[PDB]
Design a protein around this ligand. Structure first.
Ligand SMILES: NC(=O)c1ccc[n+]([C@@H]2O[C@H](COP(=O)([O-])OP(=O)(O)OC[C@H]3O[C@@H](n4cnc5c(N)ncnc54)[C@H](OP(=O)(O)O)[C@@H]3O)[C@@H](O)[C@H]2O)c1
Ligand SMILES: NC(=O)c1ccc[n+]([C@@H]2O[C@H](COP(=O)([O-])OP(=O)(O)OC[C@H]3O[C@@H](n4cnc5c(N)ncnc54)[C@H](OP(=O)(O)O)[C@@H]3O)[C@@H](O)[C@H]2O)c1
Lengths: 318, 318, 318, 318, 318, 318
């Protein structure tokens, strides 16, 4: 890239995501990666982990425009990932989700615009597509915020777009680390609905998606990566095989209310989108979900799993 | 009632709604009805229309807590109707919709709580059920706000609940005044989808719904009125007959994107609700919509229409 | 003009005034007219009335600088008309009048200055000349605000000036629509003081005044249009004659406290002003009022009245 | 009094006024006098001057509600004197005058109300009667603010009223210290208009006025003290005589724009007022001015002057 | 206790400290422990760790008074531990340290006072005693904030006090986990200054200190626990012995600038303090440091170390 | 200079300091000196004292960014002296000291940066070196604020540095005016500790120090002037001799807690500083104090004293 000599700021950068971005990009021609957040602890661990003079750490938060403006000054590109992203916590403190997810984004955009930042990519979730919960509601509203802003601001000034992705394999919310635990534990693997589906997205896929929008999105665009899926039963089988393990699979029936599949595009959006090859693009103005994609055989699932670092490390140590 | 000697504040009260509330209640035992809003013009017209010493008018807005606190002081009950409620305007200015619909409600609740207001009823829309647009998104988030607040505040202190209703017949967004215009004009009546459906709700029904929640809702409850529906074709036929008119009905096909039906309860909510007789109640935690209610014959539609003042006035004058 | 290819923003634009400005200018070489205000309803009616792609509508208010900044971006000229302008409403909510009329103007100026807007014209009232009521007090303070700002900011940067005018014939506060009603009603016309006087200003005159300041005012200037006046008795006579009507004039004596005349310039200001031909100009630092101007015969009053659209429409329909 | 065991807060208390209040009241049964302002220097001098454990000093300002709330906690009565009171400074920084004089008062009232303060007396000026300048405009608007608040708040809760007085003899703006200087200097005394008039008010009179409102005003009342006046020529003569001095009086003609007389009540207010004996009272809803009061002979002027401490000290030392 | 049926809020509760408090108190008669902070992740882990219905988690931060007020409502006692506590991060973002450590505390106090919270204990650091760095400076200023507030607020209302402690053994900043790592690693243990000293404080000691202030501090008090110390050389020897390990100790000389000892009380404070038995108390108005306490033999150090859970777990596993 | 045609703003300019700056610079080639503060009284006296069209006065305060921005517009250099500088007042209202000394400076820097001001010099105190009191604590934190800002902002943009000086001879806190009073009074001179020491700094020295930083400091630098000192006993002797007076010196012993000496540089800072000739410079990252400088004989003290205007005026008049 492309990032040659530029300065990238990542809000919410002390995450899984920020970390993936740093691995892939730190040793590039990029001039700096700034990590903007409130947690001095995590920032310190990350500092000590990379010992890199291009990692710059800024204390502040997206609800605090002052603290944003300091982080933003001289920045070329922003990946905007800060958010209150857990369902119960948005459901109990929706004002907090509003201040962080929605007003927080507004703050980021305004600050980037004022600093003449070239591009902002706002990360969103599959849960913004059929907003059912407070986290998802806040996220859908966040997308209306950047989409609205993008109309009023020339592209050549600041380009503003976003992405959606869902479950990341082996991340916090992934069932993979729970399954592998249970294998190592000599425990049964508990499935509720074995045909419940997720798109298959690793951490690198997600970073590749934001990079794609970074390169190719028009202002106002929502960008989504084409991805196969798999049932969770097929995934539990793929893992047992990988680990040459024989732990009882205990199928227990639907926990009444769980997400059956992941919707990345609604009927409405899919009807409007551009097929770009490996990505769909929804320009600023049946459904694309994990049940109606290419669903993977146990064997192909094994192949995907094996491109996962977290999975390779578990497999050696075992 | 029940409102005997009490003080009711209505935000967004310079509306259709506020006006209905005043007609029904002004000549009661209520001590005052305060009308809280920014528009001095409308407040003045309403003042001159009723010439009633119990109508008190307060200048301010829900984004301005100071101005709320003044209106709130000594208030018993609040019907919280202020909102930015039009689709394009929320879609172009979603921050504004956030500040008004979501933070604005937070302001109202906080102020009412501090003033020891007994009850707040937050009006919502059918569009909060499957939030697809920015107005609907803001509204669904508003409901998460009151529902969250209601958990943290004792009922005996302030009770906090809300209602949903959809299209009101012969109101601003109703197709009735457009149809009647076209009759009087000697014009065709243009239908896009003749089987598109709306619940049948007059203005008095809506006021009766808020009154019901006022009397019977628990804190955290969303309350919805059971109502028949009708197709728009059947409605265009009922009107032509009422007016003994013979204007060509021009059926033109779906305008690609229009709301086909009204959803008052989602699969999820309907699954959780209590049937109360004439109302469903969703307690703080397939679908109820206008296609799967009692749908009305042309003849029953005529009967409903005739309970409408706006319709009776048009019918005499013609 | 002159407005060729420029972008004009009008706060308080959903008014009588904004509407006059749009009629006169929409079909010109102007690139856009933006209408900035909180009321989505009115904005929507105006949208539907003109069906013009150059009318741009912005939701926000002058107390909210964020929402101003969005409206202001890339704007060439501002006519600043937003205000809380009714006497009782300023008298009961003077803080609200302060926030809107005075701080609101400060917000507008600051935002325009930051956006490099070329010119701001702040509309004021005859009531700022001898501020007796809260509305008038707020308005006089508003003029001190723009006048002060204009000293600190180079003209070539942003020019800042204002206008005063009083009663507009046939507008909301005009006695003309009440008189014409009474004619059509077969009712008496009630006068309190028949020699009470108003300057004679139509809506087009007012728009012409702002246009004049727009073209010719120096920064810090207050601009006022020279206008004849008439007693209200003479005006009631002119109307009866126009309508060839014979309704009893009931003269009832002064309502104790009413405005006897309109003061556009104080002794002090008139002593400082420049006579410009058709306008007086008060540069940033006996009286000019409706009793000591050219007062009109019944016959000349008829001629003025007839240049009024509102009057021409009433006269045909009758 | 009456102030027995109570706590009085004085904003703007580091003044002439605050000092007069402290002299008269410190050695009483009052429990504390709190002096609220931003200037640590003056507060320190006053501390060192009285060495009194009942003088409590609070740092903050009326624009800062936090800092007010701290000063207000447990307070019984407030004399609200903080203000930006000089003409050029309000004329150049009217926003500052607005924030201090008008919003600042709002802050004070709100804070006092919340703390259950029994009484607030807001000091105003003769210049609020025919507001011609920015200071006077801000002051008239301040009176609308307390008058409005007083309507909404029960008397038994917080009583809110104000006073007006004009020139205080021998204070900062008084011509007395300039005349006496000129006497001691062997210089001429320069008069512009010898018949220009001021009410005759000493510092003790002013404190007596606020005390009167404190005791007898209803909420919403403006209170004014009846006072004789004198021309300035008569005053220059009275002083020369007192000092048995023979300095040339140089009469130089009106400086074009100077205040000729002091208006304490407008035609409008005087028409509404209650004569209370030694005070007029304007209840919340020709003129009383220094030309139409009892005007004093040179001999009576000498008698008034001699009740002045500042005058007695000059007279001994000379 | 004592905490029987009460509600305790802990800001900064997702820490080492908050965790210690929960272990010791969760299984008591306490009615709730609320954990107030911005990090949903940590709050979620802690939720899953204790599975206790008395742990309540609140999202918000101390810079956000709204979010505090929600957490504070009905609270009996507060342990105020939220802070930006790392040296470089305060040194690079001192405004952030100010907003969090100083204004943040002000917010907490104000909110607790308004909610009638009985007691607030503000945790401070040894580094507030001779503030040399930005973190220490912010902390000393924090103590002036609570000490000032405590003067103005009756004890019986809200009692406000604080504590200081320094290094906690085996916590984040402790050298113990680095030494034990090096043992297990077969690595040398690197000492810079072997006679550099720390007070010996475990996590339980710290919790016992706050509990002590909770029970016995007067309002305005700073409370400090009496504790022995040890050199780091003696500590490295005690560990090697415990682990029956023989790793080379590499003494490397002072890193030029490191903290040689810990000062809990200055000359000034120690001169003012009350010796309470096991604690010193500094009432609201040579030095006590780790060099001039009871310094421990290698053998006594071993005994202290062994009362440490972190040390016992390492010792078994090895 | 150097100040030729430039515009200098002085916050806290109504002081001793601001006055010294005006004397030295008003009659230069400087284009304007703006004096920014809240006190209209002092600003008015200063206006009347110099009658200079280059003195511009701005009303506002450093806590109010709006009011700063107005003062800052087009400014070349800022000497930032506004502060709450007295010990008891910071000790009783530390929040106020925080808002003024620390956030206030942040405001100033931000505003200057945005206005492209070339240089800001922040005045600090010797008391920031071993912050023991709330005023000193606030001041040390202020230095961390400018030092942090200076790292993030290019020098060529805005240079940001500060100075420290201690007691100014014959200023408010100087013992000189108390001694001279006592001489003229025929009173004893009371000393507590005769060997207590202060650096010897006149008002001109201080202004020369800020000027030096103005010319030569790098961004982030703290600058301090090399100065001799004297004991207070030696100073009391020098004065008695100057005045050829024989008043009893009453030595009374240390008031337990008084400042024995002045520390301008800590061990730490002195270890880092650059000796510049007449100044030390601490670049952005045993002790220098009044006991270990060149201490002056009674005779040299007399010579210093005589370069003091305040001393020369007392000496003539006596
Ligand atoms: N003869 C007259 O002076 C006269 C005539 C007519 C009316 N009045 C009215 O009576 C009052 C004047 O009393 P005075 O003559 O003693 O006035 P003064 O000498 O100007 O004192 C007024 C005080 O206001 C304080 N102040 C200014 N802004 C403030 C803020 N934001 N917060 C807190 N304190 C503030 C100042 O204290 P710090 O600098 O310590 O903050 C000052 O000592 C004014 O309200 C005025 O309208 C006076
Ligand atoms: N040995 C020591 O650590 C030590 C030594 C001396 C003094 N102290 C004092 O004791 C306290 C430390 O306890 P600890 O060691 O457990 O600290 P910790 O591990 O840093 O935890 C402190 C907590 O503060 C929370 N926090 C930070 N900023 C916040 C804000 N604006 N609002 C709400 N919460 C916030 C964090 O929670 P979230 O990330 O979830 O918001 C964090 O878990 C500090 O106040 C410190 O001054 C500690």
């Amino acid at each position: 890239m492309g990032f040659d000599d530029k300065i990238l700021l990542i809000t919410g950068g002390t995450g899984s995501f920020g970390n993936a971005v740093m691995k892939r990009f730190l040793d590039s021609n990029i001039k700096e990666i700034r990590i903007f957040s409130r947690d001095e602890k995590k920032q310190d661990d990350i500092r000590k982990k990379y010992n890199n003079s291009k990692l710059k750490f800024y204390i502040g938060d997206v609800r605090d425009s002052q603290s944003v403006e300091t982080a933003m000054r001289d920045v070329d590109y922003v990946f905007h990932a800060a958010a209150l992203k857990q369902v119960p916590s948005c459901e109990f403190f929706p004002v907090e989700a509003v201040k962080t997810n929605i007003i927080g984004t507004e703050n980021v955009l305004q600050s980037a615009i004022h600093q003449n930042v070239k591009k902002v990519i706002c990360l969103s979730t599959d849960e913004a597509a059929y907003p059912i919960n407070a986290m998802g509601i806040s996220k859908a509203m966040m997308e209306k915020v950047f989409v609205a802003k993008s109309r009023n601001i020339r592209s050549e000034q600041t380009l503003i777009c976003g992405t959606r992705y869902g479950n990341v394999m082996a991340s916090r919310g992934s069932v993979i680390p729970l399954f592998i635990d249970k294998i190592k534990a000599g425990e049964p693997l508990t499935i509720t609905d074995p045909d419940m589906t997720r798109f298959l997205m690793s951490l690198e896929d997600a970073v590749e998606l934001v990079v794609h929008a970074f390169k190719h999105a028009e202002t106002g665009d929502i960008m989504v990566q084409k991805a196969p899926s798999s049932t969770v039963g097929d995934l539990a089988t793929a893992l047992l095989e990988l680990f040459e393990a024989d732990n009882a699979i205990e199928i227990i029936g639907t926990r009444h209310g769980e997400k059956k599949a992941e919707t990345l595009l609604t009927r409405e959006e899919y009807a409007q989108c551009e097929d770009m090859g490996d990505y769909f693009r929804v320009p600023a103005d049946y459904e694309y979900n994990s049940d109606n994609t290419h669903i993977l055989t146990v064997e192909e699932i094994k192949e995907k799993l094996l491109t996962l670092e977290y999975v390779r490390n578990e497999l050696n140590d075992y």
